[PDB]
Structures are given as structure tokens and as C-alpha cells.
């Protein structure tokens, strides 16, 4: 029972690690879109800081 629970929590943590990596990718795409929209002056230095956080 213990080795079954350990293998299943290993698979679950690898799956949600992959999902967290995909959310990091989408957040990085949001950040460099906001950085592109910050240099020319559409977005101020508040939405850029929110995307950075």
C-alpha cells in the first residue's frame, strides 16, 4: 500500500509540475507582451509590475 501511494503521488506531482511549467510559459508570454506594450507607451508602469509579480 505504501509503495502504491508513493508511486501515485510521484505521478501526480510530475503531472502538476508539467502544468505549473505551462503556466510559467503563459505568464512569461504575458510579461513580454506587456513589456512590448510598455516601451511605446500604451501601458504604464503599473500593469507591467502586476504582470511581473
Amino acid at each position: 500500500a505504501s509503495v502504491a501511494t508513493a508511486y501515485l503521488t510521484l505521478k501526480a506531482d510530475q503531472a502538476q509540475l508539467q502544468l505549473t511549467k505551462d503556466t510559467l510559459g503563459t505568464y512569461q508570454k504575458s510579461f513580454d507582451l506587456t513589456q512590448r506594450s510598455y516601451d511605446v507607451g500604451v501601458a504604464s508602469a503599473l500593469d507591467l509590475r502586476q504582470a511581473q509579480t
Binding site: 507582451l33 506587456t34 512590448r36 506594450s37 500604451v42
Partner: protein, 52 residues
């Protein structure tokens, strides 16, 4: 970069063209108040003088 989509560019471009049309109307009204000859020829005298 497709961070602000095409519709929010299209209405801004429409506002830009409407402002160009308003400035062209005002440039016509300021091209008047210096009344130009419509055609070229020998001119008569001023009916109203400087000040009327």
C-alpha cells in the same frame, strides 16, 4: 505583435481618420479668411474697403 487585437486597432484608426477629416475641415475654413481668386483676370475695385 497581436497584443492589442485588430478591432481595437480598427476603431482607433477610424478615430484617427475622423480627426484628419476634422482638421481638413478646419484647414479649409482657414484657407478661407484669405479669399483667393477663383479665376485669373483683370480685377475691379474693392466694393468694401479695409475695415468693413
Amino acid at each position: 505583435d497581436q497584443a492589442v487585437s485588430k478591432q481595437q486597432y480598427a476603431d482607433a484608426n477610424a478615430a484617427y481618420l475622423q480627426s484628419k477629416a476634422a482638421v481638413e475641415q478646419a484647414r479649409i475654413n482657414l484657407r478661407y479668411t484669405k479669399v483667393l481668386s477663383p479665376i485669373s483676370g483683370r480685377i475691379g475695385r474693392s466694393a468694401v474697403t479695409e475695415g468693413a
